Ligand binder design. Structure first.
Ligand SMILES: *Cc1c(COP(=O)(O)O)cnc(C)c1O
Ligand SMILES: *Cc1c(COP(=O)(O)O)cnc(C)c1O
Lengths: 384, 385
């Protein structure tokens, strides 16, 4: 005797192809999606350990670090933010957060939740912080950790990082960076920029399925986690024990949790494509695409949230909605008529812009010209 | 740009062979379930994804057996189910009782300490379950906010009866929380009938779906406890009041929470559908029957089972006692190299003294059990004459 099954599961799974040029999930390649179609291996199968070691080598490549303490967390990229703050901060520890968009606000939320003394450097969403802004705020607050968003997908803002680590280190402070939307889209040098903790997202520039999160921490950062008098609040992403299974220490592997092998298979292959082509050509192609996007947008009389090109994040461009234009009518027509994802605004850009992403397989000149055409045609047909 | 160069290990191709997965480990997924992964990673606000989501919620209500509006998934492996229940329901200083006769309860003791709880333990041996008396005593003693039970223990091969337990817990104003990872769709389970306040399962165990997405459900009484909380829970990522918002469990406009793993949610949809098609009961009946055969064939090898009373065995995991002077690894190795069969070693209470045989996913067939039994046999003979 059971309550009978619902009728909503009687039909098939039907997902159409979409051209995914939000900042959202990106298009993954054929090679990457085929990698999902494999045995969900055991935690302790040799073939899985092999894939994990290759993935760690690949992450040290795309992060540009020698950090042994390089792994994935099982979850979305939020998970990276959670783990850096959860692990590195005890009750009362002072964290400084540079806030000019919604991802800082998330970080402010979590750090309060883990019981930290949160200090906030506030700024306008459309301009970056100067080294002078950071120095004063570190002097004032004398924080254990600084948290900074590198590429803000909610603004289209790229925060320059050259020298912030030296400054952080002069004041005995760890430097933590979100590189979810920035990595493989612009130059990034974890070690030379003296970053003590970074994470990215599988579904942004890498063009891999969501659900698995690259993370890396510095020897200094490992040392602070080892020093803690109190245990971190979450077993699931305690980096001393997750690190163990990921074979980051001089220890026998122990079962911690069941890793999403299929997702990890897809991530290996995604890194492989970037290694094959080379990190520098991949970044340049994304840079060239963004130039083309700016040229086309200029030709159409449309503006960009971040006015100063120097400080624009190439992978996410926030296109301003002109007076008299309904944004959702454009987005809805594009999807319905071209299968194009033209995503609305978010955080500081809510209500005032669309977000145009150049990530994964949509990082080509041909995809950029189809975006502006479809966008243009979607305006005209919804506003005459 | 002068980047450190890429590693040569990425130069070659990915090669993941087919394996028969009859550990408790991950299971074999059907063709249909794996194919589902191969689809567009959708936006969090695409109608199509919202549709699949509603179908996952309907199908979860089915296999959990509940009308709970607060049914959803956590993005993560099943440990996330244990995290989120303890995390959401326990404030600094609240009192939690944890029935402990296995490694999954040790994990729950580890998590609950970290979250700042007053942890009480009811200890007991791994190879027999708790009486309703045993619970009732423990519940009087400690008068706790929540009790936490493992329904199906993949470390032992033990199944814990639950009929009655709900009404006892509620009498003392205590919530009942259950781990149904290794038991859901393997044995009967009635979330509402049995007055359960919190359950989760795993995608990779009985359902035969890929790991990474974790179904969870909480009662209207549990929801009210969380809303009553005097402090905010410690983890935004699995705060059910806001995760629950995106999954459309509440009378609020949907807000973005996190990027859900659309591909794993699609595979989960299909896995639930496979079970809906044949029907819950036939599916459970087939797995019971498979276990029966497994016991009869183990009996005919003169091998023993950690959990001695059949009335207390979990059919989905059977721990097979290593005979004295038998090298377990030499068996398991030969099983893998000659048959591509996973014969998993022991873990927790059963480490050093068992293999663990699983009847899960697409290996839940007579034909596959009969294959395990044959391959085990040949493996022993060839490595221990
Ligand atoms: C998308 C994004 C996140 C959140 O990651 P999810 O996988 O969506 O949970 C965090 N930080 C930045 C910069 C992002 O672009
Ligand atoms: C395997 C298992 C877990 C752990 O789940 P993961 O998906 O590996 O994180 C928890 N509980 C039970 C009963 C299990 O069998």
């Amino acid at each position: 005797k059971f309550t009978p099954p619902p009728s909503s599961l009687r039909g098939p799974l039907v997902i159409p192809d979409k051209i995914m040029m939000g900042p959202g999930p990106s298009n993954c390649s054929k090679r990457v999606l085929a990698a999902l179609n494999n045995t969900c291996l055991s935690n302790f199968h040799d073939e899985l350990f092999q894939v994990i070691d290759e993935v760690k080598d690949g992450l040290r490549y795309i992060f540009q670090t020698e950090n042994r303490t390089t792994m994935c967390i099982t979850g979305s990229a939020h998970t990276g933010m959670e783990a850096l703050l959860c692990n590195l901060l005890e009750e009362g520890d002072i964290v400084l957060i540079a806030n000019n968009g919604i991802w800082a606000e998330r970080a402010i939320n979590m750090a309060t939740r883990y019981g930290a003394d949160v200090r906030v450097l506030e700024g306008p969403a459309d301009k970056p912080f100067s080294m002078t802004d950071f120095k004063k705020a570190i002097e004032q607050h004398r924080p254990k950790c600084l948290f900074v968003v590198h590429g803000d997908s909610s603004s289209g803002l790229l925060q320059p990082l050259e020298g912030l680590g030296k400054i952080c280190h002069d004041y005995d402070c760890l430097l933590l960076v979100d590189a979810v939307a920035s990595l493989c889209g612009v130059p990034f040098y974890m070690d030379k920029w003296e970053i003590d903790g970074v994470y990215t997202g599988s579904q942004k520039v890498l063009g891999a399925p969501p659900g698995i999160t690259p993370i890396s921490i510095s020897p200094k950062a490992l040392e602070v986690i080892r020093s803690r008098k109190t245990p971190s609040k979450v077993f699931y992403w305690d980096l001393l024990i997750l690190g163990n299974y990921w074979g980051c220490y001089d220890e026998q592997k122990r079962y911690h949790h069941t890793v999403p092998s299929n997702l990890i298979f897809a991530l290996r292959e995604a890194i492989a494509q970037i290694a094959e082509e080379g990190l520098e050509p991949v970044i340049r192609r994304r840079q060239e695409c963004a130039e083309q996007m700016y040229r086309g947008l200029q030709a159409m009389g449309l503006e960009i949230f971040v006015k100063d090109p120097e400080y624009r994040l190439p992978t996410v461009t926030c296109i301003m909605i002109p007076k008299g234009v309904n944004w959702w009518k454009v987005s809805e027509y594009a999807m319905n008529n071209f299968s194009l994802e033209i995503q609305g605004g978010f955080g500081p850009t809510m209500g005032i812009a669309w977000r145009a992403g150049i990530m994964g397989e949509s990082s080509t000149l041909q995809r950029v010209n189809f975006y502006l055409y479809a966008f243009k045609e979607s305006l005209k047909a919804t506003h005459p």
